[PDB]
Amino acid sequence: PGSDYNHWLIVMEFPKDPAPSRDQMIDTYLNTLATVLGSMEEAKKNMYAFSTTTYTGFQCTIDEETSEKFKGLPGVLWVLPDSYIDVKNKDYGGDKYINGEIIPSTYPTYQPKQLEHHHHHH
């Protein structure tokens, strides 16, 4: 549902100690994408959304083969296909990254389906 094997959510892990700032995390997302894509220019072009609160990860337009390259990388916890949270607006959720400019998300606390926790029904 918006999932087409060319939009990928990459969930990461950060130091606690000094808590990374929000800008540090954005930079780290782009750093990670840039190492796989081989260029910072192409990372800035292909990162379209991210969170630093609800989850600590980013979402990018890369193909399936490319997404596999993230699974070994230090700091990467999950590589999962992204999907719409709002079909009408083709909204993938999370804050939007548009060539450096950040658009805060419409539903910031909304948990994406890919990161659902299953709660045992006792």
UniProtKB/Swiss-Prot annotation:
- What species does this protein belong to? Arabidopsis thaliana
Q: Its family?
A: Belongs to the MORF family.
Subcellular localization(s) per the UniProt record: Plastid, Chloroplast
Output the superkingdom of the source species. Answer: Eukaryota
Role played: Involved in organellar RNA editing. Required for the processing of multiple editing sites in plastids.
| The protein's name | Multiple organellar RNA editing factor 9, chloroplastic
What phenotype has been reported when the gene encoding this protein is knocked out? White leaves with green islands, giving a variegated appearance. Mutant plants can grow autotrophically on soil.
Which cysteines pair up through disulfides? They are: none
Oligomeric state and interaction partners are given as:
Homodimer and heterodimer with MORF2. Interacts with protoporphyrinogen oxidase 1 PPOX1. Heterodimer with MORF5/RIP5. Interacts with PCMP-A2/PMD1. Interacts with ORRM6.
